[PDB]
Design a protein around this motif. Sequence first.
Motif, PDB file in Angstrom:
ATOM      1  N   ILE A  34      38.284  11.432  79.235  1.00  0.00           N
ATOM      2  CA  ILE A  34      39.352  11.670  78.243  1.00  0.00           C
ATOM      3  C   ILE A  34      38.881  12.742  77.255  1.00  0.00           C
ATOM      4  O   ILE A  34      37.732  12.741  76.842  1.00  0.00           O
ATOM      5  N   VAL A  35      39.753  13.691  76.929  1.00  0.00           N
ATOM      6  CA  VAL A  35      39.431  14.744  75.945  1.00  0.00           C
ATOM      7  C   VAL A  35      40.705  15.102  75.212  1.00  0.00           C
ATOM      8  O   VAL A  35      41.810  14.734  75.664  1.00  0.00           O
ATOM      9  N   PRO A  36      40.583  15.837  74.087  1.00  0.00           N
ATOM     10  CA  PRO A  36      41.776  16.129  73.308  1.00  0.00           C
ATOM     11  C   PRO A  36      42.765  16.990  74.036  1.00  0.00           C
ATOM     12  O   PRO A  36      42.385  17.747  74.936  1.00  0.00           O
ATOM     13  N   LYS A  37      44.031  16.885  73.653  1.00  0.00           N
ATOM     14  CA  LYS A  37      45.048  17.813  74.132  1.00  0.00           C
ATOM     15  C   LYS A  37      44.777  19.202  73.586  1.00  0.00           C
ATOM     16  O   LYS A  37      44.782  19.413  72.372  1.00  0.00           O
ATOM     17  N   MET A  38      44.516  20.144  74.481  1.00  0.00           N
ATOM     18  CA  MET A  38      44.075  21.474  74.116  1.00  0.00           C
ATOM     19  C   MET A  38      45.250  22.436  74.199  1.00  0.00           C
ATOM     20  O   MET A  38      46.228  22.149  74.897  1.00  0.00           O
ATOM     21  N   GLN A  39      45.150  23.573  73.496  1.00  0.00           N
ATOM     22  CA  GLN A  39      46.232  24.580  73.457  1.00  0.00           C
ATOM     23  C   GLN A  39      45.948  25.783  74.350  1.00  0.00           C
ATOM     24  O   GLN A  39      46.747  26.703  74.412  1.00  0.00           O
ATOM     25  N   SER A  40      44.789  25.787  74.999  1.00  0.00           N
ATOM     26  CA  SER A  40      44.423  26.858  75.933  1.00  0.00           C
ATOM     27  C   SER A  40      43.530  26.343  77.054  1.00  0.00           C
ATOM     28  O   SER A  40      42.897  25.284  76.943  1.00  0.00           O
ATOM     29  N   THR A  41      43.422  27.135  78.114  1.00  0.00           N
ATOM     30  CA  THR A  41      42.476  26.855  79.192  1.00  0.00           C
ATOM     31  C   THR A  41      41.029  27.131  78.785  1.00  0.00           C
ATOM     32  O   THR A  41      40.123  26.421  79.245  1.00  0.00           O
ATOM     33  N   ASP A  42      40.789  28.142  77.942  1.00  0.00           N
ATOM     34  CA  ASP A  42      39.415  28.395  77.433  1.00  0.00           C
ATOM     35  C   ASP A  42      38.948  27.100  76.790  1.00  0.00           C
ATOM     36  O   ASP A  42      37.770  26.719  76.882  1.00  0.00           O
ATOM     37  N   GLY A  43      39.891  26.436  76.120  1.00  0.00           N
ATOM     38  CA  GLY A  43      39.598  25.228  75.382  1.00  0.00           C
ATOM     39  C   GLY A  43      39.372  24.061  76.313  1.00  0.00           C
ATOM     40  O   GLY A  43      38.457  23.270  76.112  1.00  0.00           O
ATOM     41  N   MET A  44      40.224  23.931  77.332  1.00  0.00           N
ATOM     42  CA  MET A  44      39.978  22.956  78.389  1.00  0.00           C
ATOM     43  C   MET A  44      38.541  23.099  78.930  1.00  0.00           C
ATOM     44  O   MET A  44      37.812  22.127  79.037  1.00  0.00           O
ATOM     45  N   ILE A  45      38.109  24.327  79.177  1.00  0.00           N
ATOM     46  CA  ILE A  45      36.756  24.561  79.692  1.00  0.00           C
ATOM     47  C   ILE A  45      35.622  24.261  78.710  1.00  0.00           C
ATOM     48  O   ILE A  45      34.592  23.709  79.117  1.00  0.00           O
ATOM     49  N   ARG A  46      35.785  24.604  77.427  1.00  0.00           N
ATOM     50  CA  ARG A  46      34.790  24.188  76.422  1.00  0.00           C
ATOM     51  C   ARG A  46      34.631  22.678  76.468  1.00  0.00           C
ATOM     52  O   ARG A  46      33.521  22.157  76.396  1.00  0.00           O
ATOM     53  N   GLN A  47      35.758  21.979  76.570  1.00  0.00           N
ATOM     54  CA  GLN A  47      35.743  20.523  76.606  1.00  0.00           C
ATOM     55  C   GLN A  47      35.004  19.994  77.845  1.00  0.00           C
ATOM     56  O   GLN A  47      34.318  18.979  77.765  1.00  0.00           O
ATOM     57  N   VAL A  48      35.136  20.675  78.979  1.00  0.00           N
ATOM     58  CA  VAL A  48      34.339  20.328  80.154  1.00  0.00           C
ATOM     59  C   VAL A  48      32.847  20.377  79.811  1.00  0.00           C
ATOM     60  O   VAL A  48      32.134  19.393  79.971  1.00  0.00           O
ATOM     61  N   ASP A  49      32.383  21.510  79.310  1.00  0.00           N
ATOM     62  CA  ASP A  49      30.959  21.668  78.984  1.00  0.00           C
ATOM     63  C   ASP A  49      30.459  20.553  78.053  1.00  0.00           C
ATOM     64  O   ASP A  49      29.374  19.991  78.243  1.00  0.00           O
ATOM     65  N   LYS A  50      31.245  20.252  77.031  1.00  0.00           N
ATOM     66  CA  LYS A  50      30.858  19.264  76.031  1.00  0.00           C
ATOM     67  C   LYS A  50      30.745  17.886  76.673  1.00  0.00           C
ATOM     68  O   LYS A  50      29.731  17.210  76.545  1.00  0.00           O
ATOM     69  N   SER A  51      31.801  17.465  77.359  1.00  0.00           N
ATOM     70  CA  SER A  51      31.827  16.127  77.943  1.00  0.00           C
ATOM     71  C   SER A  51      30.690  15.982  78.958  1.00  0.00           C
ATOM     72  O   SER A  51      30.031  14.951  79.012  1.00  0.00           O
ATOM     73  N   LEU A  52      30.413  17.034  79.728  1.00  0.00           N
ATOM     74  CA  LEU A  52      29.410  16.918  80.777  1.00  0.00           C
ATOM     75  C   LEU A  52      28.001  16.957  80.215  1.00  0.00           C
ATOM     76  O   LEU A  52      27.091  16.294  80.702  1.00  0.00           O
ATOM     77  N   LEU A  53      27.811  17.736  79.171  1.00  0.00           N
ATOM     78  CA  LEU A  53      26.470  17.925  78.652  1.00  0.00           C
ATOM     79  C   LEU A  53      25.966  16.704  77.911  1.00  0.00           C
ATOM     80  O   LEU A  53      24.763  16.597  77.673  1.00  0.00           O
ATOM     81  N   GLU A  54      26.860  15.761  77.585  1.00  0.00           N
ATOM     82  CA  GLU A  54      26.441  14.502  76.920  1.00  0.00           C
ATOM     83  C   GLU A  54      25.742  13.603  77.908  1.00  0.00           C
ATOM     84  O   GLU A  54      25.133  12.622  77.524  1.00  0.00           O
ATOM     85  N   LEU A  55      25.879  13.937  79.196  1.00  0.00           N
ATOM     86  CA  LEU A  55      25.293  13.155  80.281  1.00  0.00           C
ATOM     87  C   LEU A  55      23.879  13.640  80.595  1.00  0.00           C
ATOM     88  O   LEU A  55      23.632  14.857  80.736  1.00  0.00           O
ATOM     89  N   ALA A  56      22.949  12.694  80.717  1.00  0.00           N
ATOM     90  CA  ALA A  56      21.634  13.001  81.259  1.00  0.00           C
ATOM     91  C   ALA A  56      21.790  13.847  82.554  1.00  0.00           C
ATOM     92  O   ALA A  56      21.018  14.772  82.810  1.00  0.00           O
ATOM     93  N   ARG A  57      22.835  13.550  83.320  1.00  0.00           N
ATOM     94  CA  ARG A  57      23.003  14.070  84.678  1.00  0.00           C
ATOM     95  C   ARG A  57      23.307  15.569  84.751  1.00  0.00           C
ATOM     96  O   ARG A  57      22.867  16.239  85.685  1.00  0.00           O
ATOM     97  N   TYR A  58      24.082  16.101  83.808  1.00  0.00           N
ATOM     98  CA  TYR A  58      24.434  17.534  83.848  1.00  0.00           C
ATOM     99  C   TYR A  58      23.729  18.388  82.793  1.00  0.00           C
ATOM    100  O   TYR A  58      23.341  17.879  81.734  1.00  0.00           O
ATOM    101  N   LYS A  59      23.576  19.688  83.090  1.00  0.00           N
ATOM    102  CA  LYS A  59      22.590  20.541  82.388  1.00  0.00           C
ATOM    103  C   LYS A  59      23.060  21.994  82.420  1.00  0.00           C
ATOM    104  O   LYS A  59      23.789  22.382  83.327  1.00  0.00           O
ATOM    105  N   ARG A  60      22.705  22.777  81.395  1.00  0.00           N
ATOM    106  CA  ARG A  60      23.131  24.190  81.313  1.00  0.00           C
ATOM    107  C   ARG A  60      22.710  24.883  82.581  1.00  0.00           C
ATOM    108  O   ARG A  60      21.695  24.522  83.175  1.00  0.00           O
ATOM    109  N   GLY A  61      23.494  25.861  83.015  1.00  0.00           N
ATOM    110  CA  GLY A  61      23.178  26.586  84.237  1.00  0.00           C
ATOM    111  C   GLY A  61      23.842  26.003  85.477  1.00  0.00           C
ATOM    112  O   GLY A  61      23.957  26.683  86.501  1.00  0.00           O
ATOM    113  N   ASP A  62      24.281  24.750  85.400  1.00  0.00           N
ATOM    114  CA  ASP A  62      24.877  24.086  86.553  1.00  0.00           C
ATOM    115  C   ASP A  62      26.209  24.711  86.909  1.00  0.00           C
ATOM    116  O   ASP A  62      27.087  24.856  86.038  1.00  0.00           O
ATOM    117  N   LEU A  63      26.396  25.013  88.198  1.00  0.00           N
ATOM    118  CA  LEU A  63      27.637  25.591  88.655  1.00  0.00           C
ATOM    119  C   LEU A  63      28.640  24.503  88.911  1.00  0.00           C
ATOM    120  O   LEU A  63      28.318  23.510  89.544  1.00  0.00           O
TER     121      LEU A  63
END
Lengths: 471, 471, 471, 471
Positions: free
Chosen positions: D414-443
């Motif tokens: 779950i993430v906030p209702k965003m007004q752009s796709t750039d924003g949808m993508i920032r939210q991806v990075d944030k939600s994923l990076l809170e996980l031990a499992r995902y890490k910068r550089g990951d495709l």
Amino acid sequence: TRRGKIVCTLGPATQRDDLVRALVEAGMDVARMNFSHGDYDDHKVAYERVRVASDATGRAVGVLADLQGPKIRLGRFASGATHWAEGETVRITVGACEGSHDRVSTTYKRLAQDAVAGDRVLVDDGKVALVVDAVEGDDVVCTVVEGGPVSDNKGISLPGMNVTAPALSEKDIEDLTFALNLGVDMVALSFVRSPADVELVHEVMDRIGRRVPVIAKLEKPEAIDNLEAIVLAFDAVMVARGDLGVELPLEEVPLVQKRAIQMARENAKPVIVATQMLDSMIENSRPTRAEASDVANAVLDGADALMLSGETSVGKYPLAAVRTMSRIICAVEENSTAAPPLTHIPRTKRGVISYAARDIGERLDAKALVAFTQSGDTVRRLARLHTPLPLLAFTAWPEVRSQLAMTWGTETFIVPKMQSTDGMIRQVDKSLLELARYKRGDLVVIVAGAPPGTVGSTNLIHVHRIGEDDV
Amino acid sequence: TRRGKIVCTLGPATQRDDLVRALVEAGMDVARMNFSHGDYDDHKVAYERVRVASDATGRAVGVLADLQGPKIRLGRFASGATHWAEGETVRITVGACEGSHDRVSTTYKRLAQDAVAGDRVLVDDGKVALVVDAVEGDDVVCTVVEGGPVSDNKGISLPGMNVTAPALSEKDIEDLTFALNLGVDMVALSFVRSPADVELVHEVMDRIGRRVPVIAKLEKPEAIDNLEAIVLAFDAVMVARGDLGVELPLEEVPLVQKRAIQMARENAKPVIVATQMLDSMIENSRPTRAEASDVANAVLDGADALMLSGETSVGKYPLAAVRTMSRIICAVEENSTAAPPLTHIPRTKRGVISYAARDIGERLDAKALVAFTQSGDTVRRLARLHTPLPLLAFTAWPEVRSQLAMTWGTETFIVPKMQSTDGMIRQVDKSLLELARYKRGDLVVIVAGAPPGTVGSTNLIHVHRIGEDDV
Amino acid sequence: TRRGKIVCTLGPATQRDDLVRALVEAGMDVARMNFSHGDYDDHKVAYERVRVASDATGRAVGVLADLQGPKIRLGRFASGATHWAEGETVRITVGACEGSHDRVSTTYKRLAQDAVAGDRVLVDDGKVALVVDAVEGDDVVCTVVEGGPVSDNKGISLPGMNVTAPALSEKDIEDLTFALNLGVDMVALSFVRSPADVELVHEVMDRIGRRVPVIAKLEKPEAIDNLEAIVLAFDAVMVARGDLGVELPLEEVPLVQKRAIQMARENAKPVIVATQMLDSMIENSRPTRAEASDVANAVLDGADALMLSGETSVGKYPLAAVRTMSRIICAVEENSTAAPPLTHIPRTKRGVISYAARDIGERLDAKALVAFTQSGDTVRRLARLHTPLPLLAFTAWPEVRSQLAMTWGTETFIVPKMQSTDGMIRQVDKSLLELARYKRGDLVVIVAGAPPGTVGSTNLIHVHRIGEDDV
Amino acid sequence: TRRGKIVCTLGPATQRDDLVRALVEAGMDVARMNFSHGDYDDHKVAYERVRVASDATGRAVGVLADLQGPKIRLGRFASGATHWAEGETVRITVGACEGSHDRVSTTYKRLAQDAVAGDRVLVDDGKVALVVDAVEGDDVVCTVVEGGPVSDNKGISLPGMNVTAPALSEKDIEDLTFALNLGVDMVALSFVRSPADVELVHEVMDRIGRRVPVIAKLEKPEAIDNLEAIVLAFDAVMVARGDLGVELPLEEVPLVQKRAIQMARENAKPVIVATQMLDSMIENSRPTRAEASDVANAVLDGADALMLSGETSVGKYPLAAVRTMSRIICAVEENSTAAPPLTHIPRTKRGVISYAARDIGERLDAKALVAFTQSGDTVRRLARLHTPLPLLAFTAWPEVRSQLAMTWGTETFIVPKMQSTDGMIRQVDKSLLELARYKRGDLVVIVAGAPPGTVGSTNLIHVHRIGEDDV
Ligand SMILES: Nc1ncnc2c1ncn2[C@@H]1O[C@H](COP(=O)(O)O)[C@@H](O)[C@H]1O
Ligand SMILES: Nc1ncnc2c1ncn2[C@@H]1O[C@H](COP(=O)(O)O)[C@@H](O)[C@H]1O
Ligand SMILES: Nc1ncnc2c1ncn2[C@@H]1O[C@H](COP(=O)(O)O)[C@@H](O)[C@H]1O
Ligand SMILES: O=P(O)(O)OC[C@H]1O[C@H](O)[C@H](O)[C@@H](O)[C@@H]1O
Ligand SMILES: O=P(O)(O)OC[C@H]1O[C@H](O)[C@H](O)[C@@H](O)[C@@H]1O
Ligand SMILES: O=P(O)(O)OC[C@H]1O[C@H](O)[C@H](O)[C@@H](O)[C@@H]1O
Ligand SMILES: O=P(O)(O)OC[C@H]1O[C@H](O)[C@H](O)[C@@H](O)[C@@H]1O
Ligand SMILES: O=C([O-])C(=O)[O-]
Ligand SMILES: O=C([O-])C(=O)[O-]
Ligand SMILES: O=C([O-])C(=O)[O-]
Ligand SMILES: O=C([O-])C(=O)[O-]
Ligand SMILES: [K+]
Ligand SMILES: [Mg+2]
Ligand SMILES: [Mg+2]
Ligand SMILES: [Mg+2]
Ligand SMILES: [Mg+2]
């Protein structure tokens, strides 16, 4: 050795001593006799030289009689020839005359009645082009749009214009008669437009009491519009690209060619691709890169046979043309004999059984595939598939060997009419063992049928080791 | 309208007024400048006529400089020309002389050192054939086995001989210099045998501080031995069939052609098929049926571009040749733009993304596929796949539009260097709306990448309706 | 009617009069004789009731002797049965004793010697699970971790512990002897671990001078590690899921099953899927939805045969179990007889010929495929392929009919030993014409071979109309 | 780790302390609330224990309200249970009675009016079968033909007999109301026969002003006859094999199941396979080999979700049942996640885009596929395809996370209702990076759409490296 078959046209350049012989030695599989040219004495003499050379070399060589059909022509010019230069006004009349530069007759008497302002007139397969400006009574008034030499009785074409004319002229009927009596193995009809055209050819054959296979030459739009029906009513087709590329826009021909070959192979009918394959070898000892390509691609398309016209009939390198065509075909086949797959699963007994036989032979690394055939059909259903294995047709009807000279990949062996399948198989062993190439122990796959001596009875496949006791 | 691209060679027959213009108007996509002929003033004047006509019509027209390479030649005859008739003895010497019938120089100075009795010499690409009988010091003694006229500085070919010679002669270096400075968009190198050959071409480019794409001409066995490595080191390849068909047996060319095109497409490099495609149109207003076939089959093989040499450079029908090649290509593509599938699944980001973009556009009946490219690569990875949809490359680098003039199916639009993908997309809408072809609401699929202005950053596909607020 | 074959295990519930008969009438194709249980008198009596019912109904029924192998077991309890509840301490001793709830014997005498605290003991294929806590002299002290009923001589499994024990015990050797002499058609060996195990079974067979096909039961990891080698050394395999699902994680069984079936079919060996297919029908008149699924999916996997164990041997609904399994198999086959394709094209003569024969029969809407077989092989190479057409094996060796009772889709006809293929075919016509199912005119495809009466001589396919003169 | 989803039914065995919690910890993705049983107070309590355990663990857990529908049942017996043995005469009355062994009530009041001698009555999904002998006034006199225990309010089925009954009863309407207001995420309707049935459920939803996705339970032949239309009008389907296996011959269920799953996946709707998958684990700690097979084959079929009924609701091993089902699913997926391919190329924008996204992620060895979805659709069109890559749905609507709990392979963020796709993508990075499992550089490959917050606007794919500036 080469699988794809080579058809050569005979004419002045094959008339001298031992030339017909050397062509057979170089690989000619069918000799075309063009009844648009020559007198009956020329055709007799040439027929004979083919028979001699066939029988003397041991190579099968079919003889193809090509009938002129309702070819429209100019009449005669007072000088025998003239030059029609871009910009000139020329009349083509259905009235009688010795022509001149300005006014010349034609053989098509409905021309003034069927030609309208705008129609295009192409001469001698396109060199010289006119546009019709007007019809004044008997004369069609034209303007030369592309210039060149015209001579007595040169052919003309009216693209898109609907020609009314019988499929066989009185000349073709007499030529067909002369040809049947003289012994030709196959007959080609120029300008076919309808499946019913073959009926008229049969009508003559039956009066004379002799049928041979009839090839429909494809060089008219009506013919392509009816391609399936014509392929089914005729026994073979020839993609006759010369006239086809003026009667249709030339840019449509390459794909017509390919569709015509596929359709032939789907229905197990022979197809020949004809005309200008090695055109420049008329003057030169080596072809162009377009020409080498055109030949190789005709093989890849799945053509049973490729033809040479002026390359052997009037050119300066008849022999080199045949050897050159053969080198190219061989280069392609050494790489692969593959042909475009069929778009249907076989349903006829002979189709299904020949298709299985192929599977078997290849999967067992058999040394040859052998099929017995009375009318040729069982062999043609295998040939169409292509295979790298030798395909040896066996028959008791001599003429079938000549008829199969235009079927892909196929060598034919004449043997006595046998009354059992065991006997058909003993005959295989005997014929093959006389060859340096085969020996006892060699595995082959034989297709045969009972009841014996019955067309279409094909019903058995036998895996056999030559000389061994396994039947 | 046409996808496959047409390369035309300029020469005396295109020097006449506004002929270069008429060629561009008829469809010429790349102009070939052959440095085997002409002086620098001729090439200048012609380059200018191309730039004018390109800019005036709005059609992209790449300019291809073709370097002679280590072409071996005869020297000069005292008469300028002679006749070498079957049977005659001729000496070809590495010593200098004003030649005669009996004795003429050659430019390859290792000839006496590299030729053995039995070697074949083809002259003028095969209109005269000799066999080497002996080497006496500096002279190679030969016998004309196939006769014909020879003239000053005609080329010779020594099949299967292992030739030692620098990839670039000093002449080619000065021509390459002249050509880079004059502004040409691409360079072709004749007689490539090695991937290392491109290094020498780059060495000159870098000295001069100007790189363009380098096309490897394939016309030597060594080149085909190394086909993959050369395709990978160079930026394009040309199947150079004229010399290829004397350096290799002519019958081996058709299959080399097809495998060279496949290999180009697997690695997203342009391929041109060259030479004698419509040879007879040098003299005639309409080609042979072999020629029409050869063109169609070059398209079906998957060629980006097809080339005319003497057909436009010295022939009587430069215009008609171009129009005719275009009609044939279009006839084939109307049937289908299908190309032989690739034999690997794409692995590079740009390949995988361009392959997906195609899936999307076709599955949604999109009006166009649009791809942003800095070096052309992303567009070439889509072009190679073929598609019936318009493929519109967008770029901010003008030269790339000219370079993509030889890539299949591809039209290019120059637009400003943008700092975002939203901006790249606004630019698509604007450029396209000015076209009669596109209208708001038209669905298109756009490939782009960030960081912007960085080659190979391609990383986004957007399905977009022109003018609408969906980004 | 049904193609997939059904194996039933005999025991107390099939001992009543003409229950064996009613099973044959309900569809049983193979009767399993389980030498883990019963007196030689019971097995004799039952063998005889199978022969009677087979001969009386006219239906083929193989008899499969199943050897217990190195099965580890509990001894006897004073009550005959007890309950082992979660939490209870139980001793399993290698000493002999009056067993009770607290202490019971085992047959594996190395148990106290080879058990470590932590070893797991699963009972009766996992209805009860214990963990070993300690070894006190001859006793293995355990804790019931999963509770359930246990009874006299129930089997145990010690996963991971690699058991020392001959592949055939002295009892199995005597049972094998008893069974060969009594006349059984096939032999199954429990707990196979190696391809060399079949050699020991043959060693006994050869001593006694009588071989039958040996089925390897797959229920050890060693067997799965060596699956291919075992499938090739043995003549059939059974996926023995009872023990396999405790010797392996139960979750791995479904995929092992599917790989084992595929592997059998690739090598033309029969495969049976066994155990718990309709387990609940031991107590209930209708199976679970899981059970009906497991049966259907065994058919789709490509199993030649499915087996019932306690469902027929000890349960309340032996008959209904068989009919139920048959209804399910038939529902699936009516939809389609498809099996997973093989992952190779046939290379053996018999494989290639049988594969072709199938093609021919289906493509010509043949009424049956008929194959002559002396060892069964030629028929097994067709059976494996599946086909909706009847597959009728012909043979002169009676035992082959019983052996083929476990081969998919196959009915067998005994006929005299013939000395020609014509004669083999006359025998086809005669056998078939007696049957309501066939009549003169009916198209069939017959596989046979010469030399006659020689295993593997298979070398002909004949498409034949029954009664007609086409041979 | 596991992709296939597991549905558990709640009942008396999950009311016990901290059991709902332990199920969630063991893998439960959806909790089924069966309105055939329980007080509204029980369903409240259990709803709450699911919300708690979901929020406490962080794991998504959908709540599925299952409406009883027009289910016909027996009334109550004066012990609560009795035994109906083969051979007994039993009365089932529509009148009032003291219910006993001999005579018991039913809820279907047309039974005496609709029953004919010869009609079959199956009880408790077939573990007791009766045949009707006569109707005397209010009583249907029967003979037990298959014996078994019966208890209070067991369901009965009357095959062939056409039952009259509203799709929603008064009770179902009240339960639907209670369930909507209490907050359930999805609703199941028992005994669907028509696509119009969903309209009536919506009619109630709309009166109350709250919709959730409706699952059509498939357990009538009318439903299978209309499968496509029902799959299209409803939002999901459940293969309800218990009733389906009495309303249809049980042998036909396995193939209906497989066709129903394929049909669901073709149209991107969730499918659950239900009932008796691990039936025996009601009483036992380990399932049968049939059961383990049935589960594995449900995975291979392409089921989004598999369900447990009495295995969790009333049985002795709810935990072990869930763990066991999870072990089996995982064993199969570790081998391969492949699902039977779709029999159409995607046409909907979201189908085509999700299909491309899959291609891209797998071909680039992406670490995850991420899709934004407002209604779940975009994610369902990818899930249906299966992939071994993580499939992570992003949404701003919390209920969608619970709804997607039964979609294959899918985890939700779950993430906030965003007004752009750039924003949808920032939210991806944030939600994923809170996980031990995902890490910068990951495709990762992200699917999104503008206009933002619009169902079906999905229109881009972006290949993104986590944390990097490529957007
Ligand atoms: N040499 C032969 N002797 C007897 N019958 C033959 C011979 N060659 C072919 N046949 C028959 O002709 C059939 C094949 O004819 P067709 O189906 O037209 O190809 C075979 O099945 C044979 O029965
Ligand atoms: N009734 C029979 N009489 C003679 N030979 C037979 C008979 N049945 C089968 N065969 C032989 O068994 C061979 C095939 O056996 P197999 O290799 O085990 O499939 C055939 O080619 C026949 O030669
Ligand atoms: N967090 C979000 N903010 C804005 N829009 C979203 C968000 N999550 C999903 N969406 C929208 O949901 C759409 C997908 O909806 P659907 O077609 O039902 O899968 C996307 O096109 C997005 O525009
Ligand atoms: O089924 P096939 O063996 O491929 O035969 C295909 C076709 O070709 C033959 O020439 C027959 O005239 C057709 O009746 C037949 O349908
Ligand atoms: O995977 P693709 O995008 O099709 O690329 C395939 C090949 O083409 C390119 O030209 C590169 O030379 C290769 O390194 C690459 O492997
Ligand atoms: O399918 P095929 O080509 O007939 O092969 C079948 C395979 O299994 C057989 O049973 C033999 O044991 C092998 O020698 C053979 O390779
Ligand atoms: O083409 P797809 O994306 O796979 O969609 C397949 C089907 O799915 C949905 O359920 C739609 O209601 C259908 O109209 C659609 O054709
Ligand atoms: O008849 C021909 O050969 C032609 O027209 O090409
Ligand atoms: O250089 C060329 O183009 C050739 O030789 O074909
Ligand atoms: O041997 C068996 O039948 C088993 O293990 O299921
Ligand atoms: O409703 C159900 O789940 C059933 O009947 O299986
Ligand atoms: K050059
Ligand atoms: Mg003609
Ligand atoms: Mg060159
Ligand atoms: Mg066992
Ligand atoms: Mg139900």
